[PDB]
Design a protein around this ligand. Structure first.
Ligand SMILES: Cc1nc(=O)c2cc(CN(C)c3ccc(C(=O)N[C@@H](CCC(=O)O)C(=O)O)s3)ccc2[nH]1
Ligand SMILES: Cc1nc(=O)c2cc(CN(C)c3ccc(C(=O)N[C@@H](CCC(=O)O)C(=O)O)s3)ccc2[nH]1
Ligand SMILES: *c1cc(=O)[nH]c(=O)n1[C@H]1C[C@H](O)[C@@H](COP(=O)(O)O)O1
Ligand SMILES: *c1cc(=O)[nH]c(=O)n1[C@H]1C[C@H](O)[C@@H](COP(=O)(O)O)O1
Lengths: 288, 288
């Protein structure tokens, strides 16, 4: 079969060639296409793009960070991953009307929604243990007791909390699916920065599926990536054209070195990416 | 000029050919595939399937019923559309442990979530005016003022309310998009009964897009249908095979018979499907 990475490269080709110029919140301007989907096999291979070196350390730490239910950019930043620090800045928080909010407090985003959906948000320092719906655990439990369930959904998009977010989730929800001992996951990404966030986001959900398959005794199946506003920022056009001239390389594999029982038990050292031979890193300037 | 209906027919082919046997909640059994996407153009045509006659009256009536904010099956039944009566019957309600609920009360379903997301659900007769988030109107307001917004989402999936729903929404959420004066809509349907619900569902959202496009002064663009568990029930394989032998006929057109100002203003007589010439109707027994 063909290299799964060609789907992503193909989506980049399409947007660059046929995407429509669409202004945006950041003011950078974009080339956009509405509605896209790709299927990444998770069977004996891991979808970490090769046409560009993907910041894997960032992916792994962000997910563990999400899993802990943290909304403090400081805690992830202490791991050497600064991807969310800009959004927790004093200046940025103020530009949204969050002047009384401490620096690093991203609001009730991902982690908070996944583990405490519906809980009354105070601040990043608050203890929400036992508050709200722990969707992640409910998803894990359902997969174990009734794998045929067609309602295995973890939703980050919370209408009543959007006002408190420094940035509404680019990932509204994801759905899990089990058939013949294989676990699949589909992500609905309402908005996708193709050159920066997407490659990262793909690896992230592929990792989450591996983690959940591991503790549920299942084999990773497919990761389906569904996009809403799939866009390429104007300043990413040139670097993306360089990346398109690169031939994909066999996807690496992901090894889980230890037998884990609970999702909260995983640690960075538990994972190992082997056979990852990517082309040189390509810098995509952040939009703001 | 590939006919738009070929996508739905191709999805049926794929599932019959590659779908995997998967038991289900109803005990009927299905052929299943996880993750699918189809794009139905809404430009000078309406995607009402022709390889079988679709119950358009039901489609229109159900959507007007959603907009009214109703969660009472009887209010739709009184229009001659009985699609939700079973899910509101005494026996079915009792089977889910809702014996204290009145017959016809579907719980916090679409009507409620769309117009009062977050509000505390009491019963189908309660007045929720001013309670919760009226996502529908907010969506309309944003389309009219900031069309580039990548967060135009209407969510029906509410983790907090699920334990009260007679049937968790098969349509988790939808996202709207605007470019070149065209309004597009993507639906994330977590579970799709390909033979029964899907054809109907596709018409439902195409209609919603036509409605919003009308009140916002935009032209309908694309309707992207995204599926989670796309399945063909076993007792639908024979009739679907017959349907697949039928050549689609040009899609009809949808006419709005007068300038409507507000979404709540639409009445059934404001719409006319013209040039609809479907093949004979194909009954698809309900599963359970
Ligand atoms: C416009 C915009 N696009 C984004 O993709 C985006 C992403 C995040 C958060 N996030 C989920 C991120 C994932 C990956 C990131 C990133 O900057 N990656 C660089 C790595 C450079 C480095 O830190 O060493 C890269 O992949 O090149 S940032 C926050 C705001 C955003 N804003
Ligand atoms: C297993 C199952 N599949 C469904 O598609 C489904 C749909 C609803 C509600 N819904 C959203 C529906 C949309 C269309 C419907 C339907 O029965 N359509 C028939 C029409 C027969 C008639 O004319 O009355 C059809 O299209 O053949 S039902 C409730 C439970 C379900 N249960
Ligand atoms: C958000 C977060 C993420 O994990 N990955 C992403 O791709 N993004 C991107 C999408 C978009 O360019 C921007 C968020 O902006 P908006 O809310 O869509 O306006 O970050
Ligand atoms: C639900 C409602 C709708 O509008 N469209 C649909 O196709 N369905 C289908 C999907 C599934 O076969 C069943 C609902 O069951 P479940 O909750 O997925 O188990 O009806």
């Amino acid at each position: 079969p063909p290299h799964g990475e060609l789907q992503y490269l193909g989506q980049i080709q399409h947007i660059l060639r046929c995407g429509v110029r669409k202004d945006d919140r950041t003011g950078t301007g974009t080339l956009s296409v509405f509605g896209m989907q790709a299927r990444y096999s998770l069977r004996d291979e891991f979808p970490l793009l090769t046409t560009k070196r993907v910041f894997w350390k960032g992916v792994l730490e962000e997910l563990l960070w999400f899993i802990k239910g943290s909304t403090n950019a400081k805690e992830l930043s202490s791991k050497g991953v600064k991807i969310w620090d800009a959004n927790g800045s004093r200046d940025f928080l103020d530009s949204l009307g969050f002047s009384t909010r401490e620096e690093g407090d991203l609001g009730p985003v991902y982690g908070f929604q996944w583990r405490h959906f519906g809980a009354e948000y105070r601040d990043m320092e608050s203890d929400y243990s036992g508050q709200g719906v722990d969707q992640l655990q409910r998803v894990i439990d359902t997969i174990k007791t009734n794998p045929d369930d067609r309602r295995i959904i973890m939703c980050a998009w919370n209408p009543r909390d959007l006002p408190l977010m420094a940035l509404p989730p680019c990932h509204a929800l994801c759905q899990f699916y089990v058939v013949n001992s294989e676990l699949s996951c589909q992500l609905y990404q309402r908005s996708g920065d193709m050159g920066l966030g997407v490659p990262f986001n793909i690896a992230s959900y592929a990792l989450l599926t591996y983690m959940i398959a591991h503790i549920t005794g299942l084999k990773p199946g497919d990761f389906i990536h569904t996009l809403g506003d799939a866009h390429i920022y104007l300043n990413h056009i040139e670097p993306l054209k360089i990346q398109l001239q690169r031939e994909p390389r066999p996807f690496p594999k992901l090894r889980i070195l230890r037998k884990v029982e609970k999702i909260d038990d995983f640690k960075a050292e538990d994972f190992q990416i082997e056979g990852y031979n990517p082309h040189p890193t390509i810098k995509m300037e952040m939009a703001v």
